């Protein structure tokens, strides 16, 4: 049967500079036979594609910031944020690859309560995140056309029938 | 630079088959496995399966047995699945990705769009024509409504940008 | 008063027949024409057809000639609405409503879901298995109910902030 | 070819007291023959069935408040909010019935854009408003593991 992987919470609203903490629960423990924990975490930004952040439950991949560590064993695992910042948030996907088939938790959205100290930014955060909201529009926009698509087929195809 | 050059968005009616394409580039295409994620729109990721390109071989999750299928071609460094029958349930983004420690390098994704006539044949000439035209307008009245929505999240950021 | 009392939600695999009841209460069933109408959200209204429950006559909307049959009780003060051969399309809400001047009263409307597929792999699992993920759905449930419930919680507090110390 | 309904804007901001127009055409004119005009308006509040506002163009629908005026004729119609209150947040449609099949309108959301200078009515409306939203998602919650139930239930009671 495939590993259930439980995330907690489902959505965790802090404030920019808060630590955010992050559970992950597996059905059936982690810890393969030949000694390692197969497990990672991603961060998937919206409108963007996933990106690896932990391995093995605590090895950061090459270029992930300092801020975030992995931990735990067996089947409870944390993932923890020091500080957090407007380019972390996003949704949060813990996944195992100990057991076949390969599966993910459900994901944990992090996201702002109320934001803003906008003037305390610096220039890059502040067009950084102008920068994430353009993939956000996209896939919005991109989800219109789509819908208009189908709603132009059943007439075109009418038309070229009569 | 790593690159995995999925192909554009798919129209599709209910029952039909799709075959989309990943292109690899910036590495040797057979020394890694390439796995395929489907992921519907604000839902999670599920693992579809995966193709060895260097001898071909194929794993698949239960859940997509029959649903998918997955080849490899080495000369054109490209991946490719194949999905049959498709249903609204299958309407979703789908990523191949790049497995060593995990998944390091993702696609793009592909989107998948299941629509659905009749009664059409009902109208006109001219009144299909006419309603094919007044879509346009309202297509852009949506994306407007998207676009303002969008131009007051930015203007904030903008501004403490402007006062620096 | 006038109600439009329509039945509970249903769960329906496709390619199936679903039929939903209007009863209603409060006015002279026969002397007045009931209406249906779907709404998928975030869609339009779309108009289906009606009865009159005065004659047993119908008319339908040509979108969905085929797809509903509509029929009426006097003895009941009810009419019924029966979707045949349900795909995802069907997914929706339905409402039954009376007309004069315009819709002045209308049902809460009937919720029906189209399910999907899954048992194809689900065959090979052991009983043991099976009676472990089933119940493991009810915790999954609650976590998701419970994100709608802290969502809405957000948005009541601002409210009562101002209703306390008012 | 039925009647298109189609309305603008498709989302407008207010604070309660400006005045909101709403506007709605038609691909045909909506003049019957008989003279009449068979156009109507409706409010619809998330997770709530819809009610009438306005029949034939320009009638109040009786128990609608004077607030709420509509006008127009044959392809082109305005429903207009004299001081907009709490209770009139959400969508308002259009709707014909001169041609057959009767055709509504998607809706435009009349939304709210400070909560100190409402009153405790219009805050108490507002947080009521909140009930018939988070029902709606919770049941849609239910019937989505209910479809998830089925696939195990079946398995287990072929054995």
């Known amino acids: 049967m495939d590993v259930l992987m439980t995330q907690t919470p489902l959505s965790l609203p802090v404030s920019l500079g808060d630590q955010a903490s992050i559970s992950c629960?597996?059905?059936?423990?982690?810890?393969?036979?030949?000694?390692?924990?197969?497990?990672?975490?991603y961060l998937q930004k919206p409108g963007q594609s996933p990106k690896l952040?932990?391995?093995?439950?605590?090895?950061?991949?090459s270029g992930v910031p300092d801020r975030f560590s992995g931990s735990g064993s067996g089947t409870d695992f944390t993932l923890k944020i020091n500080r957090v910042e407007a380019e972390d948030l996003g949704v949060?996907?813990?996944?195992?690859?100990?057991?076949?088939?390969?599966?993910?938790?459900?994901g944990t959205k992090l996201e702002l309560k109320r934001g803003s100290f906008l003037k305390s930014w610096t220039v890059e955060d502040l067009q950084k995140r102008l920068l994430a909201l353009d993939p956000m529009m996209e896939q919005e926009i991109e989800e219109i056309r789509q819908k208009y698509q189908c709603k132009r087929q059943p007439i075109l195809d009418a038309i070229e029938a009569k | 630079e790593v690159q995995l050059q999925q192909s554009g968005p798919e129209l599709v009616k209910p029952g039909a088959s799709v075959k989309m394409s990943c292109?690899?580039?910036?590495?040797?295409?057979?020394?890694?496995?390439?796995?395929?994620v489907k992921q519907k729109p604000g839902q999670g990721l599920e693992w579809?399966?995966?193709?060895?390109?260097?001898?071909?071989?194929?794993?698949?999750?239960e859940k997509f047995k029959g649903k998918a299928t997955l080849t490899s071609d080495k000369s054109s460094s490209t991946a490719y699945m194949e999905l049959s029958s498709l249903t609204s349930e299958d309407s979703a983004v789908?990523?191949?990705?790049?497995?060593?420690?995990?998944?390091?390098?993702?696609?793009?994704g592909t989107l998948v769009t299941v629509c659905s006539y009749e009664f059409l044949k009902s109208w006109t000439v001219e009144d299909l024509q006419k309603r094919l035209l007044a879509l346009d307008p309202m297509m852009e009245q949506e994306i407007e409504e998207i676009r303002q929505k969008y131009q007051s999240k930015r203007q904030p950021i903008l501004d403490a940008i402007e006062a620096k | 008063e006038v109600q439009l009392q329509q039945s509970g939600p249903e769960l329906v695999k496709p390619g199936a027949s679903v039929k939903m009841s209007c009863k209603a209460s409060?006015?002279?069933?026969?002397?007045?024409?009931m209406h249906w109408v779907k709404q998928k959200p975030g869609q339009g209204l779309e108009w289906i057809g009606y009865?009159?429950?005065?004659?047993?006559?119908?008319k339908y909307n040509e979108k969905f000639k085929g797809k509903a049959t509509l029929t009426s009780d006097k003895s009941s003060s009810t009419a019924y609405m029966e979707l045949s051969s349900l795909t995802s399309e069907d997914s929706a809400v339905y409402y039954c409503?009376?007309?004069?001047?315009?819709?002045?009263?209308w049902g809460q409307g009937t919720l029906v879901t189209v399910c999907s597929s899954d048992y194809e792999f689900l065959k090979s699992w052991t009983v043991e298995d099976l009676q472990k993920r089933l119940l493991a759905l009810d915790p999954m449930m609650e976590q998701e109910i419970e994100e709608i419930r802290q969502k809405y919680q957000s948005k009541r507090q601002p409210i009562l902030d101002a209703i306390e110390a008012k | 070819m039925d009647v298109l309904m189609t309305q603008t804007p498709l989302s407008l901001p207010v604070s309660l007291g400006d005045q909101a127009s709403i506007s709605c055409r038609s691909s045909?004119?909506?003049?019957?023959?008989?003279?009449?005009?068979?156009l109507h308006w409706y409010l619809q509040k998330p997770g709530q069935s819809p009610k009438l506002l306005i029949y034939?163009?320009?009638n109040r629908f009786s128990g609608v408040p004077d607030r709420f005026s509509g006008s127009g004729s044959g392809t082109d119609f305005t429903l207009k909010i004299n001081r907009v209150e709490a209770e009139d947040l959400g969508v308002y449609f259009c709707?014909?019935?001169?041609?057959?099949?009767?055709?509504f309108g998607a809706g435009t959301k009349l939304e709210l854009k400070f909560l100190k200078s409402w009153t405790v009515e219009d805050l108490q409306k507002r947080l009521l408003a909140l009930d018939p939203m988070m029902e709606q998602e919770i049941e849609e919650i239910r019937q989505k593991y209910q479809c998830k139930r089925q696939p195990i239930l079946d398995a287990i009671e072929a054995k």
């Open positions: 409060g006015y002279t069933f026969t002397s007045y024409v």
């Open positions: 009865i009159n429950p005065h004659n047993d006559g119908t």
């Open positions: 409503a009376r007309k004069l001047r315009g819709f002045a009263y």
């Open positions: 045909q004119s909506l003049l019957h023959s008989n003279r009449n005009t068979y």
């Open positions: 034939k163009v320009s």
């Open positions: 709707s014909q019935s001169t041609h057959v099949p009767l055709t």
